[PDB]
Amino acid sequence: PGRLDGKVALVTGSGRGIGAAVAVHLGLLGAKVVVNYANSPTHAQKVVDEIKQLGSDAIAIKADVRQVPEIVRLFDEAVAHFGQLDIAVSNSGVVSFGHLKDVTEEEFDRVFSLNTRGQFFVAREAYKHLNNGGRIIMTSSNTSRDFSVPKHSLYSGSKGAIDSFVRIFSKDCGDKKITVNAVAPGGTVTDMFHDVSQHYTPEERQKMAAHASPLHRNGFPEDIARVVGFLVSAEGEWINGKVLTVDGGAA
Template sequence: MEFIMQNLAGKVAFVTGGSRGIGAAIAKRLAREGAKVAFSYVSTPDRARDVAGEIEAAGGVALAIKADNRKAQEIETAINEVAAKFGKIDILVNNAGIIEMGPVGELSIEQFDRTVDVNVRAVFVATKAVLAHMPDGGRIITTGSNLAHQVPWPGLSLYALSKSALIGFTRGAARDLGPRKITVNVVHPGPTETDMNPAEGDIADAARSVMAIPDYSDANDTAGLVAWLAGPEAKVVTGSEFTVDSGMNA
């Protein structure tokens, strides 16, 4: 891990769900660009230590905090802890998410509540909580999904519902926070090489068959876009969506 860019020098970032997959890639990329990075995790303490250790070994500053995105108080406490340690939070990345799959008729109310709590409610809670600690000109970036716009297979209705909700929230929050020059955007990854969705998994060939470029994304592809949105060149980009899906939705 090399520190080759310093677009975010002096900034403080908080990434939810930053111990693995896309969240870990985002945490490490923001650190590469000079930000002090805090991130939350729930059930992967070893991976959280690895991510923090990699950032610190390269000369960066990292803080891993255990916080369950289903519990509003834990999100709020984590954000307050980051702000108390670093004095502010310039960048919030709402990345934590879960997927519950199944036909509409077979999904339970418990699955609905769990999905909405993590994928939607927690985004609202974190965004609301961070505003007391975010200077004018801050950045709020949320990880959505290309399935918010197009659902090519059955069994994804609940996940698509939760990710679609983030679009409306992003646009509304961008209007609310514009006077403070705080930008609010959503990034929609498509199939990405992670533990949850390996490039050689059971559905990988089906996914590649509907891509314009038949390759899974690397988590760093999304992380690079998030870093740009967090940086100075994106200061007037707000209320917008960005899709990183190899042209799956083209």
């Protein structure tokens, strides 16, 4: 069930983070994987290596998805190599915490150019390059609609748009039968989660944060990776234009 054999995926921000486990978990299902990074080539080459190890194929392309020309070159290079593209997961993203009063122009642009503006043009170049029956996944947050942490407003709205984009994308991308969904991850243990959770030591806060879920454990990249896999399968087809929140009954 829900394998991706003879399919080729692209996953942005896949050298470290929910993205790496998305790819690896695509590769496991039989997807040939394009492992995008921008600043971590060492862990990109570890994902690519670990995707091949479990019996698939992968390349690592570097590209800054704040630059749109570098996104066209990402998707151009990606089809030039493997033959075709079916699946594109928009995952690259940054967190930002700060009361409204102190949010500067420079901070707002940093966060949106990647989390909102970037994704949009990673989605756009996904469609223009994608086989029919293809797949597009974008990354939102559960702080988008479901949880309202103070001094968190900039990051929140950066993903809210993402929630709104997918719904309309799902319409416009019918004429190639591509389905558009976001996953909205919650407290998933990554460099980004530990960086947030201050608002004691990261293990101490990871231990505590395990309680928010009634399952009484943390969320991990594998947790979210598994959901993209389903939605990016042919078996996930009828989930189209939906935002799946993946926190685990947390609050």
